[PDB]
């Protein structure tokens, strides 16, 4: 408590040392608990004024310190019998008196104040929940307006976690609000993009308490968000948003374990992955991909085809990063139905892209090595790959490229027989590599795999064939001394692309 008092006096004994003080406090707000209950109002007001001034480092330090302090005081007052003082004197009064980030602070205060409402006046839990629903609805229809959505999500998730008997009438409203927020994920500054993804995972954790409602609502929201995202058009031969931005979000979303654990502190990704897979598979089975000539391409439902390719690209970006361990049960089933679609209309590149990513994930975890489901999937793949290998002679690039990519993407186990099938596709891939690098790269990877895991004796008849086509790709041949802390270096490393030299 002596160090606590020293930190106190630090803030105002009457140039950014107090910001360092706020940082230090925020790191160890818990370490000073049971002695910071007193003197609440001075701390509240001083942090409030501190997160208002210049040197935005000071602003963020005060903001973080204030949220940590609010969390700690919420914990103690929740575990207090004398809980009345702090909750009634300040919280609701001040938050109402609030009416930029000031508003988000007030909303977060509401969310944390929701705790003791379960201790005393449990009806006020649902009361404030309902009035918050009304408010966010009123901020939903007005056309900025989005800088505070995640705060609403966080507070309502908190109150829902405290809540136990929810008004299911507001359930469709709230989930529609969530999905529209997810749609409005673009137009977002990266810091508050992280804020909003945290809010989304937090509301999902809160929803996890209500099992059946959890499952139904998450299925609905993932379905609707997928529909909204894939609906975004792409060019064919305020700023418009595209599907491209969202992927990292979901890439963050399904890999957000490292912060949902902390949120639990004060198996989810499994469920997110599973629900996503089911939703996308159902959407695929729903898709109306019918075409004609008037080969000649002529889709009967061009919007459906466009959304299909958009979602194909999105899921291709999304899936491989996470664990096929979670995907494992689908690898026999899912692909099968996807195969049923390809067997239906074998004139779609996206089919083969999905098949290739499926098999890439399968060999990510070594589904097969050498269970009846295992053998069934193995033989299914063998037969289907032979079919596509013999039928690829009928296609052209920008369709055939995907097909041959998928074929070469097969593991060695399946290809251990009939190298004759895979040879010409490999040669054509290596040929087209001179123009399109990624196919060349992936075919090279497959060729390494085959060399490694297959006896070289059976490849001897056509090492005389593969090497000659590799003759290709071998034919040719601010910043001042002033100490700026090199914020240019501190920025990031740019995302990787592919090159001939590598």
């Amino acid at each position: 408590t002596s160090r606590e008092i020293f930190n106190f006096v630090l803030k105002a004994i009457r140039y950014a040392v107090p910001s360092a003080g706020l940082r230090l406090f925020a790191l160890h707000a818990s370490q000073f608990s049971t002695c910071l209950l007193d003197n609440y109002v001075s701390l509240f007001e001083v942090l409030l004024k501190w997160c208002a001034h210049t040197n935005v480092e000071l602003k963020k330090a005060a903001l973080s310190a204030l949220e940590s302090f609010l969390k700690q005081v919420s914990n103690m007052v929740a575990k207090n019998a004398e809980m009345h003082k702090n909750k009634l004197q300040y919280f609701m009064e001040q938050f109402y008196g609030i009416i930029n980030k000031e508003l988000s602070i007030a909303i977060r205060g509401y969310g944390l104040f929701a705790g003791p409402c379960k201790v005393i006046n449990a009806k006020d839990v649902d009361f404030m929940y309902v009035e918050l629903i009304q408010r966010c609805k009123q901020m939903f229809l007005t056309q900025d307006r989005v800088y505070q959505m995640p705060s609403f999500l966080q507070s309502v998730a908190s109150v829902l976690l405290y809540l136990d008997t929810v008004p299911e009438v507001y359930t469709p409203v709230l989930e529609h609000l969530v999905v529209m927020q997810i749609d409005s994920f673009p137009q977002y500054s990266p810091k508050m993009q992280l804020v909003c993804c945290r809010a989304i995972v937090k509301v999902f954790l809160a929803l996890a308490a209500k099992g059946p409602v959890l499952r139904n609502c998450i299925s609905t929201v993932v379905h609707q968000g997928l529909i909204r995202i894939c609906s975004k058009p792409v060019v064919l031969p305020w700023k418009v948003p595209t599907y491209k931005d969202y992927v990292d979000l979901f890439r963050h979303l399904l890999s957000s374990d490292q912060m949902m654990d902390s949120i639990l502190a004060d198996s989810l990704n499994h469920l997110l992955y599973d629900e996503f897979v089911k939703s996308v598979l159902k959407i695929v089975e729903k898709l109306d991909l019918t075409l004609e000539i008037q080969a000649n391409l002529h889709p009967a439902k061009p919007k459906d085809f466009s959304a299909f390719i958009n979602l194909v690209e999105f899921c291709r970006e999304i899936l491989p990063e996470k664990q096929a361990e979670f995907f494992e049960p689908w690898v026999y089933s899912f692909s099968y139905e996807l195969i049923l679609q390809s067997t239906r209309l074998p004139l779609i590149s996206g089919f083969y892209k999905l098949l290739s990513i499926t098999v890439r994930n399968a060999k990510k975890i070594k589904y097969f090595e050498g269970d009846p489901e295992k053998y069934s999937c193995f033989a299914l793949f063998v037969k289907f790959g032979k079919e596509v290998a013999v039928k690829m002679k009928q296609y052209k690039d920008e369709l055939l490229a995907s097909c041959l990519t998928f074929l070469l993407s097969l593991p060695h186990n399946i290809i251990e027989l009939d190298v004759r099938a895979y040879v010409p596709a490999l040669q054509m891939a290596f040929k087209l590599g001179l123009s399109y690098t990624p196919l060349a790269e992936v075919g090279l990877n497959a060729l390494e795999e085959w060399s490694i895991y297959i006896d070289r004796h059976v490849m001897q008849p056509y090492y005389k064939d593969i090497l000659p086509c590799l003759d290709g790709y071998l034919k040719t041949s601010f910043n001042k001394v002033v100490l700026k802390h090199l914020k240019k270096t501190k920025n990031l490393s740019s995302n990787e692309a592919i090159s001939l030299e590598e």
């Binding site: 909750k87 009634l88 109402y96 003791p116 409402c117 006046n121 009361f127």
Partner: protein
């Protein structure tokens, strides 16, 4: 009302009644000139307009009598 619950916050006929109900302390304004809001509710461009304005007037007598006004 300060905690574990709270009222609604961030006057011709019904808000005048709300404000006189608020006149539990100091027994003061929102009765002296907020009656002009009742008068504005009397501008008789609608029928419920003036009937409820006169109803508020008839209630305000007992309101002010009870509130020591």
């Amino acid at each position: 009302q300060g905690g574990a619950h709270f009222s609604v916050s961030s006057n011709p006929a019904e808000n005048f009644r709300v404000l006189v109900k608020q006149k539990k302390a100091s027994f003061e304004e929102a009765s002296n000139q907020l009656i002009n809001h009742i008068e504005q509710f009397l501008d008789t461009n609608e029928t419920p307009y003036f009937m409820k304005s006169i109803d508020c007037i008839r209630a305000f007598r007992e309101e002010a009598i009870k509130f020591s006004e």
